[PDB]
C-alpha cells in the first residue's frame, strides 16, 4: 500500500449532492430548498446528513 | 459574591445586533445583507465578528 489519499469533510456542492442522493427513495415536496440546508451546515459529515433525513422521514 | 450568571455564545439576533453596533463608525453600502452573515456564523463570539469587520475596513 503506497498511495496515501486524504478524504476531508464535504464542502457545499458535495453536501448538495449527498442530500439529493439520500432522498431518491422517499417522495419529498418540491418547496424544500436543499441548497439552503447545505449552506447552513459546515462541519457535518455524510452520516449527519443521513441522520437528518432519517429523522424527517420518521 | 453570590449570584452565578452564565453568559453563553450569542445567537442569531444577538449577532445581528453586534454586527450593527460595530459598524456605526464606518460608512457601509446599503446592499450588504447582515442577516445573511448572522445566519451563516454559529460558533463565533463577539471578538470574531469584530475581527471580520476590522479586516473589511483594512
Amino acid at each position: 500500500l503506497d498511495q496515501l489519499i486524504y478524504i476531508p469533510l464535504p464542502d457545499e456542492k458535495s453536501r448538495v449532492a449527498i442530500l439529493k442522493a439520500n432522498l431518491r427513495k422517499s417522495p419529498v415536496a418540491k418547496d424544500v430548498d436543499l441548497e439552503f440546508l447545505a449552506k447552513m451546515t459546515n462541519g457535518f459529515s455524510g452520516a449527519d446528513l443521513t441522520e437528518i433525513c432519517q429523522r424527517a422521514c420518521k | 459574591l453570590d449570584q452565578l450568571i452564565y453568559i453563553p455564545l450569542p445567537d442569531e439576533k444577538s449577532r445581528v445586533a453586534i454586527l450593527k453596533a460595530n459598524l456605526r463608525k464606518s460608512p457601509v453600502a446599503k446592499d450588504v445583507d447582515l442577516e445573511f452573515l448572522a445566519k451563516m456564523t454559529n460558533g463565533f463570539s463577539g471578538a470574531d465578528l469584530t475581527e471580520i469587520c476590522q479586516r473589511a475596513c483594512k
Binding site: 476531508p8 464542502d11 459546515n42 | 445583507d33 445573511f36
Partner: peptide, 23 residues
C-alpha cells in the same frame, strides 16, 4: 514552525462565500 503556523489557520470552510444576489 509549520505546525504552529497551521494552528493559526482560519476556519476550514467559508471559501466562496457569497451574498444572495436578490433584486
Amino acid at each position: 514552525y509549520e505546525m504552529f503556523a497551521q494552528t493559526l489557520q482560519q476556519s476550514r470552510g467559508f471559501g466562496s462565500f457569497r451574498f444572495p444576489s436578490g433584486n
